[PDB]
Every structure is written in C-alpha cells, then in structure tokens.
Amino acid sequence: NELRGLWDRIENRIYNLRHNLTLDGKEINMDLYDS
Amino acid sequence: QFGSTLLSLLERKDSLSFDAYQMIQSGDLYRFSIDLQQQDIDINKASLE
C-alpha cells in the first residue's frame, strides 16, 4: 500500500509545482476588488 | 375688458410655465443619488470577503 500512496503523492506534488503559483495556497493573486 | 383679459390670461400662462420647469430640477439629483449609493452593495460584498 505504501508504493501506491507514494507514487500518487509525487504525482500530486508535481501537479502543484507545475502550476507553481499556489504553493498549495494562493501566493500571487489575492485581495483584488472591482466595480 | 380685452386688456384685463390679456393681462389675466398672461399671468395664467407664465404661472404654469414655472410649475413645468420646477419638475426637471429632480433629474440630475436622482442620477447623483443612485451613482453615490450603489457602492454600498459593493462595500457589503467587500465586508463579506
């Protein structure tokens, strides 16, 4: 079960790094408002 | 009788033309009232954020 949890963890972390600008949070875009 | 008829009708004419022009004075005030107040929806949304 550890192999299957491990390879899925690295796939999720690559997806996050491939977006970058989240850091799984929201670094770049925040507090903006309109109207 | 014709001169007092002309004079008394001309008071009735120039009185009602004042009552007309006095209405359109509201038109700018409604525009400014809406375009000031509408922002309180955007402030109530910004407060929810």
Curated annotation (Swiss-Prot), chain B:
Transmembrane segments: none annotated. It is found in: Secreted. The isolated toxin complex includes 3 peptides starting between residues 768 and 778 of this protein, which might be physiologically relevant. It comes from the Bacteria. Disruption phenotype: Cells with a disrupted yenA1-yenA2-chi2-yenB-yenC1-yenC2 locus are no longer pathogenic in C.zealandica larvae. Part of an orally active toxin complex (TC) with strong insecticidal effects on larvae of the Coleoptera Costelytra zealandica, Acrossidius tasmania and Adoryphorus couloni and some Lepidoptera larvae. The TC has an endochitinase activity. Semipurified toxin complex consists of at least YenA1-YenA2-YenB-YenC1-YenC2-Chi1-Chi2. The Yen-TC:K9 subcomplex is about 26 nm tall and 22 nm in diameter with 5-fold symmetry and 5 copies of YenA1, YenA2, Chi1 and Chi2; the chitinase subunits may be solvent accessible on the exterior the complex. The Yen-TC:K9 subcomplex has no insecticidal activity. The native complex with additional YenB, YenC1 and YenC2 subunits is 16 nm taller and is insecticidal; the toxicity-conferring subunits are present at about 1 copy each. This is Toxin subunit YenA2. The chain holds residues 878 to 926 of 1364 of the full protein.
